[PDB]
Amino acid sequence: MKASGTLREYKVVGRCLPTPKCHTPPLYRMRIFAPNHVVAKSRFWYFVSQLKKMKKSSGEIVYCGQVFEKSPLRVKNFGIWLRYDSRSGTHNMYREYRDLTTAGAVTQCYRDMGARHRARAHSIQIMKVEEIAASKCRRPAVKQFHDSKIKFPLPHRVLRRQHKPRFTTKRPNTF
Template structure:
């Protein structure tokens, strides 16, 4: 998942020689998908089709992965029942990783595909008090450094028992067939 900034506008005409330029931040797998999603949203919001518009630029936004940030994502998605609004939070190093995590969670919990999800608002949550989700609050350094949270444990979600060597080696024992004459 990558973050792209897409600029587009209507094709200039004699009546409108300098049409308004629209800018969107799109999260997609590649430039082609980002441009396609841009025209889908522009058609919905401004009634400008791809055939009557031109793409000015598509640029990938590359963030540095220095610190972990809390992201708030307001989205709208479609499932078997209808359309729903939702607010989700993610704790990641970059915006693209936070969005990839959100798309993965939505696919797992709500069976939503990429094209069924529309991002309404995406922001970095700066203040600790503005975080709404308890699981995100527990992961922040502010919460871990408090007196009552020193015993916070992070168990491995898919713990497996180690295989013992003796049992493993005896599973398929070599046996020479005996021929009786």
């Protein structure tokens, strides 16, 4: 997967074909993060084939709908569990973010795994994402925003070069 743009949470269910041996298969369900629902119903068969004896020929999906959050305005803390690949071996990883939505924090993970650990999006498997409540966070960068009456200024502001004239007689103050 390329994880192009912001990601998007999907609920995908599906079940294997009803054989003459087995009628009514159990119809499993997953939680896929993908940029569109064609990739999402492809990522469903990547994980289901790793856990059950199902594949796209001998199964189908019976729902692929975008599930999205019941509070896009509340600020939430997300702790997520990872299974990325490194150059030497593969690792388990816990990781905490802070965003207004589930899909925007997992997008913030793939940007961060590429930034810190150089881990490409085909090599990292999200295990579970859930919103966690404060005083159960363990990452002190997320923890330092838990402050009622939090305050800081903006130091040393820079933007808008060449738009405001390339050639001016005016040394631009950085506040």
